[model samples]
Each structure stands twice: as C-alpha cells, then as structure tokens.
Target chain A: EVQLQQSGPDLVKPGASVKISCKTSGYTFTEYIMHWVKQSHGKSLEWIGGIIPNNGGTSYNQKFKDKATMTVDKSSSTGYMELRSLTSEDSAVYYCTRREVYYYALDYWGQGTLVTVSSASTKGPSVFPLAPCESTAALGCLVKDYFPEPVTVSWNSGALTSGVHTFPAVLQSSGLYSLSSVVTVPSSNGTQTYTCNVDHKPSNTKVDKTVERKSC
Target chain B: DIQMTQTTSSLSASLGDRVTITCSASQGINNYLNWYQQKPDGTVKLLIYYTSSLHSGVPSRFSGSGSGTDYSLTISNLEPEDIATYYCQQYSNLPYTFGGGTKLEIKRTVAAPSVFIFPPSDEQLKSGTASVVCLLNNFYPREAKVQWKVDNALQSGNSQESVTEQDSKDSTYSLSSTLTLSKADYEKHKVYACEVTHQGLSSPVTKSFNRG
Candidate 1:
C-alpha cells in the first residue's frame, strides 16, 4: 500500500500564489504518476494535473490554465503541484496522489493541504514530497467507478445542476464508488459548460459546473 | 488504453476564444464520454459528456460533442478561472489512458524546457565495478533506449533493465546497467556513458558517471 502525505494549510491572500508538496512512500515513486488535485470549501474535487517521475512528463486540467504547476523531485521521492496567481476561487484543499490501477479502474487521491484565500498572508510549513504510508495505500479518499451511475452532489449553495453520469458511480455494498475523470476546457472559451453525468438503475442524473481561471 | 490528442493555442488565453481538442481510443472503447475541470487543490466539476451534454449547474456556454473513434471538447466565452490544462480520458477501460496535457496559460505563457545531462567516466578504478541508471520521466509512449558504455564503446559485459508504469499513460521508469573492468581496462580519466534514445525528438543523451 503506497501512502501520500501532503503539506499543511496555506492562508494566501487574493491575487497571490502558493506552492505545496506531497511526500510519497511504501512504493517506488516511479511506479505511478504523482498527481495533484484540489478540493474547495464544500468538498468539491478538481484536477490540477500531475507529473510523472520516470520521464518528467506532466498533464493538467484545462480549467487550471496558468493557475498551477506540476513538477517532481525523484531523488527525494517527492512531487510538487503549484497553484499560481491568487483569488478567492483558488482557496481549497490541495492533495497529491498516485494514479492507482484496479481491475479496470483508475483512482487518484492525496491527503490534502487546505489553501484559504485571505486578506492577510502567512507562509505555511515545509511539506514532504512523499512520506510513509502503509503497505496498501488507502486510495486517499478517492472513489473510482469504471462505470459511474448518474447521481447528484449538491452543496449548501443549492442544486448546482441536475445530474449526469460520470464514470458510472453507484451505491456499492459499502458506499459510492466512482473513478475520477480529468477534463480540460479550452483556454478562455467561456461560451461552454462541462458537467459530470452518470446513469443509475433508476434514472440519468448529472452534476454540472463551470471552469474559471485567474485574470491578469 | 485510450489517448486524447489535444491541440490548443496555449493554457493562458482571453475570454471566449473557441478551443478544440481530439480524443481517440487506443484501440476501441465504447462508453458514455464526459469531461471535468480540476484546480491544483480543488474539486473536479463535470464539463461535458456523451460528446454533447451539459450537467445541470454547468454554464450553457460549455459544451461537448463527439462519438465513436473520435470526439471533441469545446468551450466558448471562456472565463478567467477557466485557464488551466485540459485532458480527455476514456473511462471505458480499467487501465485508463489520458492525452498529453495542454497547459492553459491565463493571459501568460509557460515555457517547458528540456533538460540535458552528461555521463561520467569509469577510467580510474577504486570501486568494485561501475554502474549507471538513466531516467526518462518526462516523455511518454514508454519507448526510450537506455544503456551504458565505456570509452564510447558499448559495454559487452553490460545488462539492461526496463520498467513501465501501469497507472498512467505517461512513461515513468528506472533502469540500471553495470560494467566490469580489470586493471588493464582502468584509466585515470576515461568516458562511461548512460545513453538514452527515443522517437520524434532526435539525438541521444549521454551522461558520464565517475568511479572513485
């Protein structure tokens, strides 16, 4: 089981930027791609992209645009994903994870670092690129569904959207399982919307959201 | 494993400039298609699906439409928060593959520079034997030839090891090769190479390591 230990919370002011780290252990760092993801106030998951240690190759979420950077330090067995610029929208929980492969599913996850957009600024602590986890890395809070059934995730903000089927998530014997899908939106083409849709036994439901970036 | 081939202007862009990318199956994968947006440390929200279906909360401007062997993801009236790398993934397979990332620069540009390294030498002998490991972590397709050599000569007494990652399409690897030399083959200053060769990108990389 591989383990991922992320950095602490960062209190960054608007219009500024911050960087965080994830320390991985229990497995060879090169075995999987070190991915960085973000979580907002109400546990909204976002893909920031990731870096591969073997070749230093990287991929990102188009919505992040210039908002983040993904890099790696193979020597230390640690990986970094940076968030650039600053805005209230950038405030969220950042995490580092390994793309784990199961029967026909890929799930990403990390411990997470909470980034808050504040009026006042304060630096956080130094984080390990990767630390120690158990023999079996617990998939960090990730839910993977090679087939996602339609379901809706509503925040206190109310119904963000109706619902769509994504990765075909379903209520399993334990809980809901879903494989995360990373989508890139074209830069500055605001005339469109992206949604996560899924089909369940009862109906087809989806939760929709928009992609926004930092303005210069 | 399916791969998404994306061609976009850049990561950073102004508002409402049409963007396009192509998603292809490595072999043949049939399933509903969808897209999502994730920040460095944020939650992933749905974008598009089945090629053209918007989730409830998504802005009407964001739309996707494609099917079969090929598909397209388009976003109009792009917003600032929309500036980030975009990816296309096929959930149809267990070992999922993603397209090489296209970073979106928000009113700015990112320059990804390639790194070059030089191998050391094994002429002066103090250790039992000399060995080296070369990593090709930045490139993909899992196709790069890496080996060790002495004085520009391929070490016949050498061995090679190659590894591929099962999680991501991006190739992440670690391999080692060793060479043995007797007293006669030892020198104070000679060359030992850790060479790597790949496709498209020309020229091989040779880095030298020392024996002390």
Candidate 2:
C-alpha cells in the first residue's frame, strides 16, 4: 500500500545546480503530487513538474518555466525537487509518483534518482512511440523510467518461469550505460502481457509496458 | 494525462550561472523533447533531447539546442558540482510528466549536503577469492549506470567490462565497471555496494563497504 524511493547520483560543474530527494513508505503524506521526470538517449517520457505537500504547492510546465523546483515535507512523508545548473545537459533519473489506488494511473512508482554530468563528468523524452513489446529482458517490461538522458537500455519479455531471462547492465556515469529486465510468467503458462518495448532513437521513438501474471 | 512545467529564479548558485529551465507538452510535444537534473538529495541528470542531439557522452557546454514546443537547458560553463535542482520531462504520452523544480543554490549557501563520502572498491578475499570493481566517474550522456551490491541486494555477472575517456576538454566521458562475487557467496557477506544509475531520472548513487 506504500513504497516510494529515489535519492542518489549527482555531481555538477557547468553552472552548478542540483537538488534531489524522494522518500515515501506507505501513503498518508497528504494525499499525492510529487512528480519530476526526464529521459534522454533512445527517448520518450518528458514532463518535469508537479508537487504539493498541502501548503507547499507547485505547478510547472511552461516548459519548466524556471528550470525546476518542487517541494514537499509533509512532516516526513518526503518529496522535493531541485535542479538548477551544473550542465552536461543537466543529467537525469528522478522519480516519486504515487496515486496509490486511483489518481488516474500511477498506482505507485519510485525507483529512480540518477543525475550525472561530469567535470569530474556526466548524464528521455517520449512521443507517439509505443509498439515495442516482444517481451524478453526477463519478464516484467515496465517502460516508464525517464530522466536527464533516458534511453539506450531496453529489453524485457517478462520472466517465463526461468526458461532463461537475465538482463543486467547499468553504469549511468563516465561513459553511460543502462539495463532493465523484469518478467514473471507461470499462471499455468498460457498467461499473457509481459512487455517493455523501447526503440528510443531507432525510428524516432517507441514504447510499451506490460506485466500481467497475477495470483493473489 | 498531459502536463509538463518548470520554474526557476535564484534559490542558490556559485559554480556557474546563466541557468534556465523550461518544458511544455500538454499538447504539442513536437520533437518529443526531454531534459533532467536533480540534486537536492535525489540524483537525476541528463539535460536535453530531440530538441537537439548530444546524448552520447554529453558535455558541449551542456547544450540542449531547442526547437519545437519551445525547449532549452543550456549549461555553458557551470562548475562546483553545479549546485542542484532542475527538471523538464516529456516523452510524448501515457501518464508520464515531470517539472516542478528550480533549486540552484550557492549564492552564499553552505548548510546541507555533506554526508556522502565513498572510497573503497578494491578488494580480494581468500577461500575461492572474489573480486568487484565498478567505477564511472563524473558521468554524462554515457547514459550512466554502475551496480553490484552483495549483502544489500543485486549482484550479477563475474566479467565482461569496458572503459572509455574523452572528457579532457569539455563534452563528457570517463567510465569503468567490474564485478565478480561467486566464490561460494564470498564467505558470509556483510555489505558491499557500488551503484550509480541514470537513465530516466529515478535516483541511485552508492558506494558502500564492510565485507571483510
């Protein structure tokens, strides 16, 4: 019923500016609203704005009008956004979205927080791009991970019961790298839905997300 | 479900200025734009997109080159870890949107940000003996990622590594990563972390230790 985590990676040096933090364990943080996204490299998924902890509201999208600044601290529910300068494009990977059960669709998301742009060196966007789900990086293809430069890491068909699924490779820094694959299939075997199609820069864009193999 | 926004106006700065953040797509996501940079304690950085085309190893002064839908996230020459806070995302559609950040402090700030000291990625135990080396310094358009945690979680592959470097002038480059831990389970395993992820802004940066 709760789970939101994101906080890590960031080393600027162009026109310096960095501020990231997202921590939520199980709802009651004053409802919802704490969004910040961006992804480059094979691309799709861009819209960095939204945050409100009741009295610390925000609403951006005038193209990010100022750059970035979404705050939250509902006592300790945790939710904050900040990214000023320190270029290299501004590097990426920041997440904290939770509608819990019905905010439209965002049941609960929080597994991102990566920003790299070096001196020292560093760091997605989306479109109609959707129709890339052959499924095969593991079994749980959930493509909705965007940030500074989100793309160049795709594959996931949803775990087919261990027949063979393993996709791992992530080095978001220095020269950059990415990897993701989560699939699980066993509901007898005829089960369906296990996607993650991403062609970010192939024919312009493409996206797919699926993982339906439930058993409660 | 379309709505992207960003705002900034001096909350902090120092390494470099001339900072600007903007993004839009409640309707026209034209080039399908993108941009990211978060560091208020939640690391997420990438900076630019189809608005241009420099997502390889990024660092041409951190230029995003905008065009359709009105986009821009230039960085010219900011340093000192580039302060923090800046985001503008839009990948087209499907319950995806972000931009509510603008925190570029440094004008005269210096209170928070300090508990992140890591140094220890060169180990070789006994028994069957194991090894793990992961490093991707500075980070940029390389896409960013470096993971290998034992006692905490996630650990795969024993080999297959690579290295690069083109970060001498500006742009961006300097990557490294190596992992290996199967010597039975490396004794008992206490703690071992080496994570650094970037590729759609989620937040990841680790370098733990304690596996004697």
Candidate 3:
C-alpha cells in the first residue's frame, strides 16, 4: 500500500542544479529507505545514490559519486536528490525507488521527475504547404509556433520577391512566435512546381511545403 | 424489456454443490436466453444458448431452461473448475440486455504482476523503426491493463498484445506486449514508458525505456 509521488518536471540551465523530491507515505518510512536513480532517454538506469531515513546513511554508485547527492526528511517522510553540474548527460528522468525493510530490494518507485538540463530548446514549426486559393494562380502559406525569430519563409515560384510578402512575427500569449507568410504565384499556365519553404535556423532544418500547380 | 436481473449478486457455492442461477426479464423474452460462465480470469465460456440448448464442447452438467419472462442456468454438482461468475443475456428483442452476474464464490485470491519493459532492439533501429517489449509476470485474477507513454504522456494506441500464458504450477497469469515506435524516436532522445495496472499491485508498475 506504499505510495511515492515525485515532484513535477524541472527545467534547468545547463550549468545549474535542481533538487527533486519524492513524497512518501503508507509505510514505515524510516525502516524502508529510498534510492535515487537516473534514467537517460532510450537507455538503462544508473543508480545515483540512496538515503536511509532512520540514520541518514548514504550510498552512491561509483558512476554518479560526484554528480548526485541524496538526502531524507524523516519528519515528512520525503526523499531528496540534487544533481550537480549537469550536462546533457544529466538530462534524464530521476526516479526514487523504495526498498523493503527486510531485505532492501526495490519494491515501490516514485513516478519519475524529468530534469531537462537546458533552456526550453528548439521546437520546429508546424507547416503544411501553402494551399492554393480557389480559382487562381496564387498560393498562400501558413506557419505556426516557431520561436525567437529563428525562422523565415523562402519562396520558390514562377516569380520571386515581388510576389512574396513576409508578414511580421506575431507574439503569442503563450510566449512563443507565430508566422503566416502568403505569396502570389504571379504567373503559372501549365504544370509547374513552387516550393514554399520555412527555414529553422537553430536546428538548421527546412520544411518545404511544395505545390505542383496547373491553372488554366 | 431492456432490464435483465440476476437475483443473486454474490453466490457462495461450495465445491461439488449444485447451483442454479436465474435471470428475469422485465418483459417476455421468448427463448433467446444466452448464458455464459464469466470466469475470474475474465474469459467467457458459452454454456447455454437459446434458453435450453448447450453450446459445442461445453460440459453436460451446465444447463439452461426458460421461456418468455424468466430464464435459469443450472450447474449440476459444481466442480473446482466451475467456480466462476455466471451471466445471462437476452437477445429476443431489439434491445439486447445482460443480467447482473452471480459471482460464485467459494472464491480465491488475486495475483498482481511484476512488470518489466524493454527498449527497442538494435537490429530494428537499423530499419528506421523498432518495437518496445513489455512483459508482466506472475499475476492472477487476470484482469489487467498495460499501457505506454512517450515522454511521460499517455500513448493509448501504442500498446498491442503479444501473448499471454498461464503458469501451470500456480495458476497465475503472464502477458507481453509491443509498443511500436520509430527507431529515430529512440535516438531522438524521447523517453518511452510502460505501466501495468492490476488488482495485486497497490499502484501501477512503471518502467521507462532507457537502452541498457
């Protein structure tokens, strides 16, 4: 009947540190201790350290000897671990495991707390190709949620520059950026290709929404 | 009528005891009674259909008899294997209805599972996609759910059943599943998770895929 509820997700700067919490209940908290572990994405687990609530006795795996620290609060039956000097290596889910009093085997676990060690990083914009306007040679493009102006709309069409209108970036209430760039085809009589591309600078990725058009 | 009633909700029948469970309809249902044994393991066995006809491969000790407004399923000298919940469904009308089941107890204990979730294979990663395997072992009263999560958010459609086996020695149950994903999603550094919820465990057992 034991329960271990972990704290919410954490976002930290690359060189900074964060203290993750494991709120414990429904057992003899002092007798059954808690162990901290690091679970890297798509990889196995690494034991960080563990703390005994009864005496604060501590143990750390050799790999995380300096990178991790474990502590316990007997009064609140809570467990704590602070990851120090984090790099991308430290960006992983930190889980607190509960050990049985009798033999010290892990039986219960804390719903993991994810520690993302970086500024909220690059997220690509969602763009579908500029859908054609009804009954015309003109095409329009729409882009959503590209951050910090690290984006631009480049047109590949029958005529360039003159038909392109790069709209000003709109600031969203959610604090990211939104862009909608629409351009005219100017001239397209037969089967022709125009690729409306959005370039993401930080990730250096391009999203080409191409339209093969034939307007009689 | 749409309402079907099974008078006994908690039936306590001993081993070798003859038990007859009844189902009553709000209106006449003719001879369209379908009776089935809903075992503790969550599997169903069709014992009787069309009121009095026995299903193929079912034992003769199980019987059904009814007409119009009432139906009954009689188990003659219930054996240890006959310890199950029984239900009667009426299909004579437009609104097919099921009776509240009679749970035959001389019951037993439930088993919760120990779950382990595995990461994508290195070989499948070479092909641009891979599957995560989850195995749950030593659980009983086989009603359980397995689920997947990507980066801690629930991915409901991601889990597919692989196989289930019953332990011959202890009557416990074990199951495995596959959580399919792009191999690049693993390399994309997305954390994949699997959880098992069963009566035996106080809370759901969770394991995240961190390539070992």
Candidate 4:
C-alpha cells in the first residue's frame, strides 16, 4: 500500500502562486513516476504533468505546461507541483498520485489540496436566470462571480420534480468563482418560476435569483 | 502533435446500452492516449489513460482499448448517469490535443438552460470601455444562438459568443457570450442585454445588465 500525504488548503491573493507538497511512503518512492492532477471547482480533471523522480525528468500536459511546474526531492521522498501566475482560474483541488510502472493509470492518490485565489471583494455569488422551458424538461442556473472557498448553490424554492443538481464552482481567469446547477421539472403547462440560492460559507451570506419560465 | 478525431460527436443511448466512442489519431501515439469525462458544468474527470487502463475510482463499466493510431472508450453497461461528454486526448508528443468531445445523451430528461448577464465592473465603466458577459448553463444538445441588445434595440458591436460546450460529468451544456461596449455607451449608462435562443426554450432567454 502506498500512502501520499499532501499539504493543506491555501488562500492566496490574485497573481500569487502556491506550491503544494505530496509526501509519499509505504513504497519505493523513487522507482515510480509522480503525476499531478487538477480539478477546477466543478470542471473536469486535468493531468498537469508527471515527473520521474529517479532521473528528475518531467513531462507536462501542454495545456498545463506553462501554468504548472513539477519537482521532486529524492531525499524527502516527496513530489511537488508549483502552479504559477496565479489567477482565479488556477483555484482548484490538486491531487498527487503515483503512476504504477507496469500500468498506465495512477494507482495511489494523495488527499486533495484546495487552492483558492481570493479576490478583493470576495462578493457573494450571482445566480443566472432560469431558462424558459424548451424541448428538455430541465432548468439550469449559474451561480457565479465570487471568491474564497466553499460556496454552495441550491434550489431552495420551486416546483422542482427532482432535487437540485449542482455542478462544481470554477475559478475564472478574472479571479472570481462561478458554478452551474440544474433541476429537472415537468413540462411547463404555464408560467413557472424557480429560485437559485447561493451561499458563501466564509461570508455566511446567501443570495437568491429567481427566473420565470414559460412552456415551449 | 498527434491529431485525435472522434468519429461521433454526439451519441444518444438507452440505459444498459453498450457505448463505444472511437478516436483515430493522425499518427501513431504509442498508446499514450487518454480519455476524460466532462460533466455538463464543464468539469472533467480522467477515465482512462495509456489506451486501456482505467483510472482509479472510475466505474469498471468505463474502459479504454485500442492502440497506436486507433483508440476507443467503451462503456459496457451504460447507465443514466453515464451520459455526458467524452474526450480523447493524446499525450505522446508536444502540444497535446483532444478530440472534439462526444456528447452522450439519454433519450429523455434532456435539460433546459438558464442564463445570466454579468454587468461591467465600475473600473471598466470608469475606463470608458466595458464588457458585459452572458453565461448560459446546463442545457442539453449544445447549440444556442446569442444576440446582443442595447436599450431594447439590436446592436451590432464588438460581440463574441462561445461555442456551446457540454459537461461530460453531468451531460449538460454551458456557454458564454460577451459584448464590449464603447466608452460613449458606458458613459451614457446604456442598458445591455444578452438574448439566448435555444431549442430548450419556448422563447429566447434574455438577461439584462447595467453598470456594475
């Protein structure tokens, strides 16, 4: 069994970068390659790059080559990823994992470290208006343009047929946070309204946006 | 750079369907290809890498196979939650590229979209030029039309609309439209609106914005 312990969460200002460390144990640390993965607030996972600890060789996903840098210390048996030129877009959960020499996938993963780019205002989230009824029976909303970690958006009020579906909040390049969520409802027989409630945990404040929909 | 071309850009399947998405590279990639699932919110998760290996925590139903210039991701027993977008990326060379994503949709429960307008900030207004952004999120069938309106009138200025994108994780759609206003417009405090027309809506979704 391989164990990877990672650094703690970070709150850095815009334009300032943060470095997270992943200390490995229970395996021959240097024999296998180390890979870095990034998950931006509700977005997909991106392979930042990989490092061969033994030879100190590195390879990066071109999309992340300029944004991420990787290094390792053989003595400490730790792998490091330095995300540079900090922006809101760089705010994400990063995980360090070891690539099995014989397999193509990562076998062991470190607990994720959350890195947030705090903007000056750190305002509460703004919710997008609900789209009118269309061919699909789902209603979508966007809660965006905020900062700091842990903002939750929920469908607090509405005639929703199902529970609210929340997507991950992503950090935009402008140093703000944005998230999208949706709820599935029956076809609109007439006008219906739904409310999207956004909560900023750090601020302990909530904002709601309501949108009216008409049947297609 | 190896080019990855996905044969199917969109797929509609029923539950328990055997879904196979194929990608052909411009040249051999030595099995250094990977697959990712993008949820409707535009977030992605690694599914498979190096041709045939599944990422940890990913469902066993999700598997990657094939080699060299050819690759495929097959969902053995597709479930409703499995519907989303899939992308094939090649890491065998410099400038990694991804295949145009394949959207997997359930025959029913396709979702509608919601939109919002982001007002220009005070700084941008003070600077004499301002940009208003319109975000449309969580719609299915990633196609939407966006138009800009100023003071209830159609205005054609510096405007850009992004390609509608699907989230592979949730099987939804999202997009953004931006319109830059001139200093004069900002100084006058003119109202701006983003009008989005999607198949999901009976009428166009309109979001209005003023100054920040």
Candidate 5:
C-alpha cells in the first residue's frame, strides 16, 4: 500500500543542474534508507547512492562521488537528488526506492524521473559560481531558477539603442533565461575597471575580469 | 493452515521466452490464490486475482489457471520487462500466506559464483551449539541453489536464501546462508560443506570447511 511519487521529467541545458524529488506516503519516512538508481537509455540499473533521512547520512557510489548529491526534507517526508554539471552522459532515468530496516528489501519505488540534457554553446550552468568569461566587452545576466514568465521574457534577447548584444545563456527546468549586454570599455591598454551585475562575474579564479567584455 | 508449496526457486530467463510458475496450497484455497510480479526495484503488481481473473491493466500475455489448491501462472512470451520475482498468495482462509518468491533474470553473464564457507567462531559457539556461515558472491542470472552437507551427507537445517544483494560495479548478485550445528557435531569436529547448482555455469560450485 506504500506509494512513492517522483517529480516529472526535466529538460536541462548542459552545464546546468537538476534536483529530482521523491515524495513518500503510507509509511514513516525516517525509519529506512532511500536508494537512488540510474538507468541509461536501454541499459541496466545503476546504484547511485543511499540516503538516510533521520541523521542525513549518505553512502555514494564511487563512480558518481562528485556527480550526484542526496538530501532529504524531514517535514515533507521526501528525498531529493541534485545531479550537478549535467551532460549527455547524465541523460538518463533516475529512480528512488526505500528499503525496510528489517526484512523487506527495496520494497517500494518511485516511477522515475527522466533527464534530458539540452545542447548548449556556453559552459553548463553552475549553481555554485558564475561562468568564466571570454567577455571582450559583452556582459550577461541570468535570472535564477523558478521565475515569473513576464520577467524572464523581457530580459531574454532584450536590446538597447546601443550596439550591445543580449541573449539567453542556459535554460533551466523553471524556464529560466539570461541576457547579455555590451560593456563599453574606454581603454584596453591597462586594467580598466567596469561594473557588471553579479551574474556577469567570471566563474574563473579572477572574478574581477568580466567575460565577454567588449573593447569599445 | 498457512502453508504454500511452490516450484523452482528461481529461473534463468531471456526475452521472447515462455515460462510458467506454479503454486499449490496444503489445503484447498478455493480459488483464492493471487499472482504477483515483483520487479528488481521491488515494485510489485497484481497480475491475477481469484486464481484466474486478470487484474485490470495486466497484459493478455500473462494468464493464470487451476482451481482449488493447485494453481499455475504462465507468461506466453516473456519480454525484457517481464524479468522479476513472482509469488502466489492464498487468502482463502483467515491467515493469508504467500509462497517463496521465484526470481527470473536475464542480461547477466554465465558467471559461476564464488562460494566461501566459514567455520563457526569460538565466541558464537555456546557450550552446546555452533554456527557456520556460507557466503556466495558474484553470481549471475539469480538462479542458483545451495545445499548444506554434514560429514559429506546432505541434511536440512535452518537455511533459506532467496534474498540477494546485487554488486553495483558489476550486475552480479550475492547471498549467504548460515547452518547451526550442535555441540555433538561441533565437538566431534565434523566436516561441513555447501554445494551450489547454477544453470548458467557448466559445472556446480562448492566449498567446504575442514576440522581446523
């Protein structure tokens, strides 16, 4: 009688990340460990890791050590997996199953969440840092995940009277988009300072150096 | 009255293959047997109810027959998605009891499992009893059997090993069974062994414990 309800499919741009959730019912969530499994198209099942909600302890598969992270929301009785830096290889169906502490082994399982990594030109979306720049004078900004439709559309592909270029960066599950603008620099002779939004900062070591900075 | 007799503990199966699993109750079940399929992920579906009636969306390929205490469930042409552990439960009486699961697997190599039988430890050996453990590791197809032998003779003990753990690195499966021998046998230092029978492998695999 137990049921595991998983979130829907995700179409994420490469270099971006996705968090899939598995909601539980008909049983106490904290009593057992939840196991995450991965299945490539037409492939056998892969054990990604196990997450214990009570203490929030996890055991991960060596192959996916940094690639997958597991977490839980005790109040909601749900388990979550955040797969970082997605690629074509990460394009697979993920499932969550719970094993009873006593006799029963992985008794109930979620339907499955299919992840399709969309192709992109720029580096994948980074939840932790801004993408590094080849910004010659062009600066960009990205709206975070889960945004209002009106706000995201106006920003994407937006343009001013100046010769500044504005376009989207990476698309997330929540219809997120980024816009870029031309940063008119007076001189490229020495280190000239420019002010760009937090989203336009470099993902590389030198955060001061903006990417896509145009030389005017 | 909660006894259920079933057929082949497990089977080696492939796509486009046909298979059947049978189960009969000790007493008349009065057509109350229910057939269930449990996938590798542990998800189960009711394939049949009232002995022969198909459960709502179950495919026509799966059918059940037989009345009274004897019932059989058959799959006309097994598909890759048909791979799973099957069971039969009888609810004719008060206390419903289910048969031991019958595992069906494919896509695994014909690798013979490595069997290791460890002699009982001194700490676990009480003044009158001792226990030995037999571990079977890295096997394929999930259709293997382990028989306990005492002094080179086959004998029954408290042992049942249907539950198996799969190796994530490789798709192989592993399981263990323990045999407890009393003081009379342990004190006498009787030899102990386990014999494994797997259809995938050309020959059977076995391991034994000496009087060390």
Candidate 6:
C-alpha cells in the first residue's frame, strides 16, 4: 500500500534551478527513508542521495554533493529534492523512492520528473594540462573542458604496441566535454617522445602535444 | 573509491531456473552493497542491499549474499519478466561506483495487463475533491508502471497506489491507483486517465473517464 506520487515535468533554462516534490502515503511517513535517483537521456541511473524523514539525516553521492539538496516535511509526508547550478548535463529525469530501513535499498518509487535544460553555446576543443606518462607502467594524456563534442583522439608513436586507450567523454556541469587517452610504454633510461593528437571537426582544427618520457 | 567489476557481462537462463550474478570490488566493501534492475527504457529499481537483505516489494525468489569485496545476486526461480540488465553498486566509500552490469535474457513469453478506470463520485464532486480510480489486473511477473494524465496532458496529483499483489491461483498480479483532483477539473470536463505499461504489452493499456 505504499504510494509515492511525484510532481510533473519541468523545463528550465541554463544557470537556473528546479525543485521536485514527492508525496507519500499508505504508511507512517517518518517510519521509512527516501532516496533520489537521476537518469540522463538513454544513460544509466545515478544515485543522488538519501534522506531520513524522521531525523532529517542525509547522505549524498560525492559527485552530487553540491548539485543536489535533499529535504523532507514530516507533517506533510513529503520529500523534496532541489538541484542547483544547472546546465545541459544536469538535465535529466529525477525519481524519489522509499525504503523501510536506514541505508536499505529503495523499494517503492514515485513516477519520475523530467527536467529539460535549454541553452546556446559556442566553444571549441582546448587541450588541458597534460600528465606525464612516465609512471612505472604507462603514459597518460587528459583533456578537459572542451565544447562542441565528438572529438577524435590519437597517439603518435612507432613504439606503440598495444591498442590506443581512450576513456569515455564526460559532460561537465558547465556543459563541456572532458576525456583522456593513454599509450603504454616500457620504462627506460633514455628519453622517449610521444604525441597526443586531437581533431575537432566543427571548428576544423587539430591540436597535438608532445611529451618526453622520463624513467620513474 | 571502490571500483566494482562484474566479470559476467551477460547471462542467459530459462524460466524456473536458478541464476547468479557476481560483483567484486577492488577494496573491501563490507556489507555496503546494493543491487538494481535496469531495463532498456532507462527505468531502474532496487532489488537488494546490505549484501543479503532484499528490498521491500521485491520477490523472495531474488536474494543477495556475500560480503567484503565479493558479492552476488541470485535468483532462485527465474521468470521471463526477470530478463533485464542488473547492476551492483557499493556505497562504502566516497564516490559510489557501479559494476558494468549483467544482462539477463530468457526464452519465454509473458502476459499483459487488463486495465479499467472508474469515474469520480458525487460526494467527491460536491467537496471539490474528485477521486479517480484505475485498476490493472492479470499481469504476469508483477512488473508494471502506472502514469496519470488529465485533459490529455501528463498530470500529478495526490495519489494512493497499491503494490502489486500476486493472485494465489494464477501467479499473476493485480494493482490499482487512486488519483485525487479538484472538482473544478471534473466540471471542466477534463479527461482523466491511467496508463499501465508492462514489458509484455506492445502498447500501454490506458483507461480514461470524463464528467459523464
């Protein structure tokens, strides 16, 4: 008989904030705890945090510590989640679910609330601070805060034996893309040079940075 | 952060068979573990937590065990509706992480739900509080979603929905939801509806009501 009814969809502009509500019934409201979840378009669900309606205690995913705020109203049997510092990456459907025991898995869920973020942007790919790949194992190249996504990454090295290692691109809270690519190399006394190349199509630009390996 | 690794990316099983999915963490996670069921449509539900405790509303057939760095989610008697992607997450440290995921597929067919909607009552209309009820019955595997709409647009109101109840005779389930709205909506001829969605249904089963 536990029921959770949530608010409706929302369309907010970039840099704005939105708060969704979940009303619960069919049991003592404070007898259970509530958790919040986030889902991007066609992406896996992300656990935001959980809140105890009785004591107002809270725990959040470090990634969403500053972005999502959780609260509750014992008198009304309602749980609220407010997401701030909005961006296109923050746009997603949010759900509220409840559990009987503290730190337990969410059992009953409220229908989700869709939050769409809309904005315009103009930025090109920019190389970020490069980490020396001179560790005992491999060389690493990290790129951060680049816009107009879908960039191509490559490593330049004749000594490259294994396949190129490219990590998934992550959308930052600022609506920019960040990723990393690495190449494996053996540790040696002499210096070995490698170049990390990036190609951005929308701007028709290619950027490359060379790094010389030093034995660790 | 404790990194979770699910070695088995996919699993195949038949109805009434036993299936197990395992997840390992780089460091000891103790009992701070949880499991979830995800579908292609992007909706997910929690199945188990604390390594062994099954979440409320989850079937007893689904269970979890193990501790420290290793954990497993086991299905004692799998059903066709149990076919989906499963994930394990650890909250023992900062930056909770989830295992890649395990996809489950079975070789069987499922049945859809039959739904009905009841109109508002006179007392509710007089009190400016209109309660609309929707019923869904004979759904196999007991997994379904209910949505509300008013005047052909998605709406949210004070609602009381029941958990799926299994029919001891047929193993199917029955569920119902009651939505409370304002009398103004009924007088305005707003059409209220409840849409029941299940994997077995090619299209959602919808029932609606008007002032009449």
Instruction: Please give, for residues B55-171, the per-residue lDDT of candidate 1 as tens digits.
Output: 557787677766676777777776656654555666564333455545554332222112222221222123333223333333433346666666677765444343322111111
Which residue pairs clash in candidate 3?
A: A42-B211, A43-B210, A43-B211, A44-B210, A44-B211
Measured with C-alpha atoms, the lDDT of residue A78 in candidate 4 is 89
The deviation in Å at residue B13 for candidate 4 is: 3.2
Give residue B182's lDDT in candidate 6 (0 to 100): 67
Candidate 2 at B189: error in angstroms? 29
Alpha-carbon local distance difference test for all models: 0.48, 0.51, 0.65, 0.70, 0.62, 0.71
Q: On residues A1-216, what C-alpha lDDT tens digit does candidate 3 reach at each position? A: 668888766657778988888988888788776777565654334456677798989877666878888888888888888888988888787778775422123456666776767666666676644332212244445455555444657777334554444444455555665554544443444455667777775456678776544445
TM-score of chain B, candidate 6?
Answer: 0.51
Give candidate 5 misplaced runs (Cα > 4 Å): A101-104, A120-216, B1-212
> What TM value does chain B of candidate 2 have?
0.28
Native-referenced DockQ of model 6: 0.07
- Quote the positional error of residue A158 for candidate 3 in Å: 51
List residue ranges in candidate 2 displaced over 4 A: A1-33, A36-52, A55-94, A97-216, B1-35, B38-70, B74-125, B129-159, B164-212
Report the C-alpha lDDT of model 5 over B1-212, residue by residue, as the tens digit.
45777767677655567788888888887787777776654455667877777766789999999987788889888665676778787757534457876776555456776555655544335445454656555567667788988787787855434334343345566655656566677767557788988876577776776765
Give the TM-score of chain A, superposed on the true chain A, for all candidates in the order listed.
0.53, 0.33, 0.56, 0.57, 0.55, 0.54
Q: Evaluate candidate 3 and give its CAPRI docking class based on DockQ.
A: incorrect
TM-score order, best first, reads: 4, 6, 5, 3, 1, 2
Question: At residue A109, what lDDT does model 5 achieve?
Answer: 65
**Considering just chain B, what TM-score does every model have?**
0.44, 0.28, 0.51, 0.62, 0.52, 0.51
lDDT of candidate 1 over A1-216, digit per residue (tens): 556777655666677767788888788888787766565654434456767799999877677768988888888888887777789887677767665442111244564676767574222111001000111110001122222222333222242222111121223332333322222223444444343332222223233332222233
DockQ scores for all predicted structures: 0.01, 0.05, 0.01, 0.14, 0.01, 0.07
Candidate 3 lDDT, B103-179, residue by residue in tens = 76553367776665555434446757565656565567668888787777787665456333333235455555656
Candidate 6 lDDT over residue span B67-126, tens digit each: 889999999998756767898988787565788888775534467766656665453366
Q: What is the lDDT of residue A57 in candidate 1?
A: 93
For residues A1-216, write the lDDT of model 4, one tens digit per residue. Answer: 568898866777887877889999998877898888777753445668889998999988877878888999988998888887898888788888777644355556676887877657546665555353143344556555666666656675534535355655555666776655666554543455677876675455677766555434
